[PDB]
Amino acid sequence: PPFDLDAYLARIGYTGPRNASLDTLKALHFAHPQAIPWENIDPFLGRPVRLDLAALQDKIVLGGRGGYCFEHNLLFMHALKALGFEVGGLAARVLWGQDAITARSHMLLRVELDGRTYIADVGFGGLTLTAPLLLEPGREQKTPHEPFRIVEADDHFRLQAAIGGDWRSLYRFDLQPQYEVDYSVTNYFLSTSPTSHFLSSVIAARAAPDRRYALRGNRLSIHHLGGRTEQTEIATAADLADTLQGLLGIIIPDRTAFEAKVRETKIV
């Protein structure tokens, strides 16, 4: 069974030209993270996260749900390939909120356009990129949201975002290619290891034209573009599920089990 490009583009609301241009890459990179939320509902509920194409597009595209980094960026890669882009998988060690050396727990993409290398990443979370970036060290690059830059550190690169007047590192990466089987090993760990916090907390995000929504446990943050950050404490399991399903457009397959676990584990 092939990748259903029509259904994917309908899922993200893209009605533009279908080609392998930079303009198209920019339009898809803006739309995807607004249409499809970042979330860990399945890992939280102990449900398997499948990365194979058939399962991935059933869940996110037909089923209208979201996912976390591997789900987002594998999906995006499938779309970019179907549109004719030259795209490869990469991996990264997360620096945001992180001991000395962290695992390669994140996925991003490289896209080759007329001999130039871009990175793309629609799956990081709170600070998911809303434009592709030129792999050009040192340079501040504007996006439809925050400014980003890539800095060169020995062998590797760090992707940084400008937050509260500081350059903050999201993650570090090299150009080693990665394939689906590599991501499946890391995904198994993140989604099922008792140590992994993707299993024990509720975490979510979604981009919007003039803001980002981000949620960690019982704290909702609305980051207005070039503006204030509104923060809300969420008092109950019920209001947590309301916020996810209403405001963030996130699907909770079993709300009772969800609320039950939230109450059990003292998240609120």
Ligand SMILES: CC(C)(COP(=O)(O)OP(=O)(O)OC[C@H]1O[C@@H](n2cnc3c(N)ncnc32)[C@H](O)[C@@H]1OP(=O)(O)O)[C@@H](O)C(=O)NCCC(=O)NCCS
């Ligand atoms: C879970 C997550 C979405 C929560 O984001 P959040 O709600 O903004 O909360 P965080 O605690 O992460 O943010 C840290 C601080 O930076 C600030 N911040 C985060 N995003 C911001 C933005 N877009 N603009 C301004 N400030 C921001 C927060 O307000 C917070 O401020 P504080 O220091 O006053 O508390 C985010 O931590 C995340 O995306 N984590 C990475 C997930 C990951 O590992 N992905 C790859 C593997 S799948």
